[PDB]
Amino acid sequence: EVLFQGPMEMILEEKDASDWIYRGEGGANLVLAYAGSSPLFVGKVIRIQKARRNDKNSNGVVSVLTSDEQHLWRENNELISSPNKEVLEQRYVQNVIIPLLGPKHVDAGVRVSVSKEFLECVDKKVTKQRPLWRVNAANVDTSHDSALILNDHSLFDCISVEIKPKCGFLPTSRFIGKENMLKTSVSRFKMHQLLKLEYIEISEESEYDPLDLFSGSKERVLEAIKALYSTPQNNFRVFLNGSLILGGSGESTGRTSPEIGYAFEDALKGFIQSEDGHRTECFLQLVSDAVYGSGVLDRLLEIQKLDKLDIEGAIHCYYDIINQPCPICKEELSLHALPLDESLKIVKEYLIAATAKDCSIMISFQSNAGDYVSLKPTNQTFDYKVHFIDLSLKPLKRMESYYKLDKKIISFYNRKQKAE
Numbered sequence: 001e002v003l004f005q006g007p008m009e010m011i012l013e014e015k016d017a018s019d020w021i022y023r024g025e026g027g028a029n030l031v032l033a034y035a036g037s038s039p040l041f042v043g044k045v046i047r048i049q050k051a052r053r054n055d056k057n058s059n060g061v062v063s064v065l066t067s068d069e070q071h072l073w074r075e076n077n078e079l080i081s082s083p084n085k086e087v088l089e090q091r092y093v094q095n096v097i098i099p100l101l102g103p104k105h106v107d108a109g110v111r112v113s114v115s116k117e118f119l120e121c122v123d124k125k126v127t128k129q130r131p132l133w134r135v136n137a138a139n140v141d142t143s144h145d146s147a148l149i150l151n152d153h154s155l156f157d158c159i160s161v162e163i164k165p166k167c168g169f170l171p172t173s174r175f176i177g178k179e180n181m182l183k184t185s186v187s188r189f190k191m192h193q194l195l196k197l198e199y200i201e202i203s204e205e206s207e208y209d210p211l212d213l214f215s216g217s218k219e220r221v222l223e224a225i226k227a228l229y230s231t232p233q234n235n236f237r238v239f240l241n242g243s244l245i246l247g248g249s250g251e252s253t254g255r256t257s258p259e260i261g262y263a264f265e266d267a268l269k270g271f272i273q274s275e276d277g278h279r280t281e282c283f284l285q286l287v288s289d290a291v292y293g294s295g296v297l298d299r300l301l302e303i304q305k306l307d308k309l310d311i312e313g314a315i316h317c318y319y320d321i322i323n324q325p326c327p328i329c330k331e332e333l334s335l336h337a338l339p340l341d342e343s344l345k346i347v348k349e350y351l352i353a354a355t356a357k358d359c360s361i362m363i364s365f366q367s368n369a370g371d372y373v374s375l376k377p378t379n380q381t382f383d384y385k386v387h388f389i390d391l392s393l394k395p396l397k398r399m400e401s402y403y404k405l406d407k408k409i410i411s412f413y414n415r416k417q418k419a420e
């Protein structure tokens with residue numbers, strides 16, 4: 001009844017850069033929340049890929065996947081034919097992860113086209129709010145023609161929490177050698193804290209142990225969340241309506257000092273309804289109920305355990321996949337006696353586990369003022385949602401780095417334990 005021009009593909013131009021604020025960032029992507037007008041963007045974030053400042057198929061053409069990654073992920077043509085890295089992460093989540101993890105807490109993204117001018121702006125603008133050692137190691141990849149749009153998981157007063165639970169299980173492989181028996185006793189997360197000190201990457205050993213979080217015991221789950229609150233590092237963040245109010249911003253943070261402790265107790269003023277000196281403890285018993293009560297950590301743990309054999313065994317399958325003289329083996333004859341397809345599934349499955357040990361989850365909480373919980377103490381009812389984030393695809397080449405880091409972790413823990 002009045003001409004509406006047919007559909008078109010959204011393309012953020014240089015104009016539209018002023019509409020997004022720095023939200024955070026990891027070692028790979030740059031997240032920014034929307035501050036403007038359009039309903040196509042109210043309550044959404046945009047995920048832009050950074051590129052390390054140090055760094056192609058056999059015609060010297062930039063390539064989404066090596067041949068081996070091509071072969072390894074071939075059980076899905078959609079996925080191994082992705083022309084750029086955004087559809088690739090978008091099809092990894094839809095075709096590999098969502099079938100494993102269920103679709104209810106996992107939102108594959110939506111691609112938006114973007115100009116090089118857009119990306120060159122957001123970089124210039126945000127580099128103020130980034131931690132300094134993030135800029136000096138990765139800027140915005142100003143070649144991509146796509147970026148990711150997701151729902152913002154700190155909105156719908158609202159208080160959101162972000163957990164990075166990491167690997168919550170002990171290996172039991174035959175391929176773990178006697179000198180490394182400790183790996184069957186101490187969580188890699190625990191043995192990793194030492195080496196991180198020996199590199200001033202944290203200042204205090206973490207209170208947190210992922211064996212508690214994943215124990216499935218609501219009691220030890222509460223220990224974890226209390227341990228997270230205490231020594232947050234890069235495992236625990238809290239935001240009040242979009243803004244951080246505990247934990248690091250694109251980085252980890254030192255112990256929670258009482259000063260922070262009192263700033264957080266009041267930060268919760270009114271959201272939690274309680275008397276001073278008791279709102280922090282309620283907030284922690286409310287996050288523990290939403291964690292436990294969703295059963296979301298359980299299937300998460302099921303994927304992590306696709307790491308059946310530990311890097312000490314999967315490493316050997318990898319030098320098969322890329323046909324190579326196993327450096328490790330010198331003088332298995334077993335793992336190396338496996339049909340190619342079985343070599344492939346171990347390496348494949350190990351990398352899908354690496355995705356699960358590395359994602360985060362975000363529980364979001366709104367006010368009284370269906371899906372919910374009720375603080376046993378303060379007679380309040382909050383509603384919540386839980387979502388995963390950073391289900392990225394780990395590059396195959398990294399099997400060698402996975403191994404070399406594992407080797408160092410236990411090698412360091414061994415000696416620092418024998419020293420006594």
Ligand SMILES: O=P(O)(O)O[C@H]1[C@@H](OP(=O)(O)O)[C@H](OP(=O)(O)O)[C@H](O)[C@H](OP(=O)(O)O)[C@H]1OP(=O)(O)O
Pocket residue numbers: 026027028234354358392394398
């Ligand atoms: O231990 P390394 O290798 O440095 O890094 C870990 C991980 O690599 P991998 O675990 O998949 O090998 C990185 O993956 P990427 O983001 O590059 O895809 C990040 O998730 C990083 O987080 P960050 O510390 O930057 O926040 C992790 O460190 P964490 O141990 O502190 O969680």
Ligand SMILES: Nc1ncnc2c1ncn2[C@@H]1O[C@H](COP(=O)(O)OP(=O)(O)OP(=O)(O)O)[C@@H](O)[C@H]1O
Pocket residue numbers: 023024025026027028029030031045047150151152153154162358359360389390392
């Ligand atoms: N959908 C979302 N809603 C709200 N915040 C988000 C969302 N996605 C990412 N973030 C924030 O941006 C930060 C970095 O994003 P993301 O994890 O996707 O990139 P990454 O570099 O792979 O990081 P990580 O290794 O921490 O998962 C996260 O720590 C998170 O707080």
Ligand SMILES: [Mg+2]
Pocket residue numbers: 026027028358390392
């Ligand atoms: Mg990542």
Ligand SMILES: [Zn+2]
Pocket residue numbers: 315316326328329332336
């Ligand atoms: Zn070998």
